[PDB]
Amino acid sequence: GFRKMAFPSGKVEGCMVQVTCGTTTLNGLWLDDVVYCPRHVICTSEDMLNPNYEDLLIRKSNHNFLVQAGNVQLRVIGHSMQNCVLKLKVDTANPKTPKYKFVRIQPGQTFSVLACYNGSPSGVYQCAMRPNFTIKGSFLNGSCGSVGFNIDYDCVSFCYMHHMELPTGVHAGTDLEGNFYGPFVDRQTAQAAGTDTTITVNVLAWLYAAVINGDRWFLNRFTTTLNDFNLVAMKYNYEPLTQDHVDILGPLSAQTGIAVLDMCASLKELLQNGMNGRTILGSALLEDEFTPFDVVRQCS
Amino acid sequence: RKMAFPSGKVEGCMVQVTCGTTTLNGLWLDDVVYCPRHVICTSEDMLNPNYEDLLIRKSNHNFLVQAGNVQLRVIGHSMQNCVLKLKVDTANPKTPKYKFVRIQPGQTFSVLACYNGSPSGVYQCAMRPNFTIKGSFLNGSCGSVGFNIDYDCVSFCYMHHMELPTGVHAGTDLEGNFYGPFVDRQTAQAAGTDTTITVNVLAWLYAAVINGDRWFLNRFTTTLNDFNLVAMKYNYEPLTQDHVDILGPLSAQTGIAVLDMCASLKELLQNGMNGRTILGSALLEDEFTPFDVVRQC
Ligand SMILES: *[C@H](O)[C@H](C[C@@H]1CCNC1=O)NC(=O)[C@H](CC(C)C)NC(=O)OC[C@]12C[C@H]3C[C@H](C[C@H](C3)C1)C2
Numbered sequence: 001g002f003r004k005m006a007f008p009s010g011k012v013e014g015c016m017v018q019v020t021c022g023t024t025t026l027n028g029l030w031l032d033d034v035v036y037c038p039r040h041v042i043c044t045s046e047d048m049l050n051p052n053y054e055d056l057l058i059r060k061s062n063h064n065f066l067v068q069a070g071n072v073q074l075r076v077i078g079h080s081m082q083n084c085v086l087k088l089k090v091d092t093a094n095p096k097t098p099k100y101k102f103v104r105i106q107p108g109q110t111f112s113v114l115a116c117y118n119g120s121p122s123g124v125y126q127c128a129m130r131p132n133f134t135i136k137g138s139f140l141n142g143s144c145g146s147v148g149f150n151i152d153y154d155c156v157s158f159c160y161m162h163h164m165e166l167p168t169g170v171h172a173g174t175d176l177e178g179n180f181y182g183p184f185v186d187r188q189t190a191q192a193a194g195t196d197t198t199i200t201v202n203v204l205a206w207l208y209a210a211v212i213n214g215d216r217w218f219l220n221r222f223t224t225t226l227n228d229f230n231l232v233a234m235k236y237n238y239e240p241l242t243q244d245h246v247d248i249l250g251p252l253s254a255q256t257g258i259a260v261l262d263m264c265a266s267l268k269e270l271l272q273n274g275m276n277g278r279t280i281l282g283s284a285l286l287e288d289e290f291t292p293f294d295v296v297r298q299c300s
Numbered sequence: 301r302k303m304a305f306p307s308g309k310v311e312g313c314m315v316q317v318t319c320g321t322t323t324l325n326g327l328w329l330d331d332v333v334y335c336p337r338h339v340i341c342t343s344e345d346m347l348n349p350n351y352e353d354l355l356i357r358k359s360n361h362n363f364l365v366q367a368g369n370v371q372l373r374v375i376g377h378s379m380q381n382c383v384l385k386l387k388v389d390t391a392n393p394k395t396p397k398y399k400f401v402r403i404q405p406g407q408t409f410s411v412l413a414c415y416n417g418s419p420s421g422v423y424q425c426a427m428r429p430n431f432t433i434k435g436s437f438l439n440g441s442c443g444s445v446g447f448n449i450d451y452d453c454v455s456f457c458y459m460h461h462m463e464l465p466t467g468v469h470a471g472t473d474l475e476g477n478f479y480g481p482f483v484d485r486q487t488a489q490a491a492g493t494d495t496t497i498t499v500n501v502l503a504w505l506y507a508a509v510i511n512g513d514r515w516f517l518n519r520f521t522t523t524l525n526d527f528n529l530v531a532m533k534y535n536y537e538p539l540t541q542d543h544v545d546i547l548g549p550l551s552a553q554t555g556i557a558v559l560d561m562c563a564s565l566k567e568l569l570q571n572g573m574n575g576r577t578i579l580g581s582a583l584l585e586d587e588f589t590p591f592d593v594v595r596q597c
């Protein structure tokens with residue numbers, strides 16, 4: 001009945017290593033003969049306010065990096081920096097390398113996080129990228145380099161690497177090319193995320209899920225244009241819909257026979273009038289962290 | 301965050317088991333595959349089975365076990381309560397250190413939901429006081445297992461067998477004994493009245509505080525017995541002194557005494573949340589144990 005369901009993590013567990021500079025240890029991702037990790041592994045507690053990463057890296061050699069899979073050292077044979085990620089070339093190809101891709105996700109998309117410490121997995125959980133490019137994770141000291149991913153058939157799509165916490169308790173990070181999601185930088189400074197908003201496309205997915213399960217009191221007789229809906233949505237701190245959102249609701253629209261813009265008109269009415277005491281899927285609150293793909297998985 | 305254990309050690313044990321047109325999942329440990337015995341039923345048999353009768357009519361060769369694209373040869377079979385044990389001629393090199401445990405109501409575990417021998421998703425479950433689990437399971441999910449991991453050791457505690465009309469789920473331990481008053485027959489079965497896992501609600505209120513949510517705290521206090529009277533009135537489980545002790549570390553971390561947090565929960569039960577939320581929830585959450593909360597700090 002709609003659990004937060006993560007992808008099986010084994011294919012990613014088989015790629016996790018630890019990377020140490022000095023006493024600073026974080027996690028890395030070992031794929032083929034390259035290890036990827038956050039570049040702030042090279043910082044000391046004095047570099048961290050505004051590190052000159054290019055200068056810090058010049059002062060490093062291959063022999064300054066301790067890369068371990070469990071207790072077994074992996075020899076580093078080259079090093080480079082790509083945006084905010086370090087790439088360490090190693091002399092061994094990971095025999096557990098899955099089929100994989102590096103992908104950049106959009107806000108509202110969900111993914112699984114394998115939270116790791118010292119290269120060892122602790123737990124797996126499902127996260128949504130918020131519209132302000134933060135995630136509500138569970139991350140302690142030593143969790144950096146933990147990754148987020150989706151799995152399609154045989155293929156692991158890596159989409160997130162963890163780098164930092166914001167003063168509000170939420171989390172920020174990069175894709176596997178080292179480019180931050182959102183307007184954040186890897187400096188130990190207080191950084192503010194944009195005001196967050198509700199993930200409209202996911203709320204619509206949730207409403208389709210309710211219909212699929214026979215809970216449909218909120219369907220009305222009307223429709224809306226996408227532009228009219230977007231202008232109303234923003235007044236309720238809901239994200240505007242994109243053309244890609246309309247398209248990814250296609251399968252659920254087809255399964256239910258309810259056109260996307262008709263469901264938008266139903267959601268608009270819910271926003272303007274409230275639930276009037278009623279519930280949807282046994283909840284007085286609308287859920288915004290299940291995507292249309294996440295619904296289709298658990299329903300059908 | 302509801303957090304499951306990493307599922308890799310279990311993924312390496314999942315296989316597909318087929319008898320006739322009935323297919324489900326099995327757990328391959330060393331040279332034995334464990335699976336629900338109703339794999340031997342036709343969909344018709346499932347409506348009311350005599351399992352010993354059905355099993356005597358089966359040979360080793362009626363069981364098709366597949367590990368990916370690779371068929372494993374069954375060389376023996378036996379039934380233990382509601383689980384079938386299929387001896388195969390190949391040992392699983394991916395077998396982790398493991399044990400079989402029977403969990404108590406209120407304890408939590410991770411489920412690796414599987415279809416056709418292939419893992420699909422992982423999530424965290426509590427054994428309800430009425431011995432159901434609020435799972436997410438579809439056709440073909442039987443033989444999926446629940447587990448906890450301690451160090452390198454996988455403790456298997458649940459194997460999935462059925463759904464109830466209310467949409468909750470029922471199954472067995474790895475010795476084949478059901479949790480609760482349920483039977484592996486395709487008939488509508490109701491559970492006993494469920495209750496809320498009080499020690500877990502308290503653990504989660506402490507998690508709300510640790511993450512800076514304190515609107516529900518108060519200065520009232522209570523004795524253990526007076527709290528338990530109110531708890532029971534609201535269909536909450538009694539809190540034992542062992543529960544109070546288990547909460548100690550969380551009490552120390554936050555500096556809120558257990559019975560003080562009991563007084564906050566009493567006020568929530570009597571007054572409600574007044575449209576407010578705790579850790580984003582409009583309802584009190586009871587599927588995090590104290591240990592779950594600590595581990596995640
Ligand atoms: C890498 O393991 C950690 C992950 C952090 C630790 C706790 N939760 C996390 O998500 N990353 C960092 O420690 C990171 C390092 C820099 C990018 C070089 N720094 C960081 O996350 O800063 C957090 C704070 C939050 C507020 C108080 C204080 C000063 C700033 C505001 C930044 C730390």
Ligand SMILES: *[C@H](O)[C@H](C[C@@H]1CCNC1=O)NC(=O)[C@H](CC(C)C)NC(=O)OC[C@]12C[C@H]3C[C@H](C[C@H](C3)C1)C2
Pocket residue numbers: 324338341346347437438439440441442443461462463464465469483484485486487488489
């Ligand atoms: C094994 O894969 C399935 C898992 C079930 C299917 C759907 N969701 C599940 O969790 N197990 C069975 O199909 C099981 C077989 C018996 C143990 C022999 N039968 C079952 O779960 O029946 C569920 C229903 C629920 C209501 C409608 C209908 C009649 C009864 C009430 C029992 C099926």
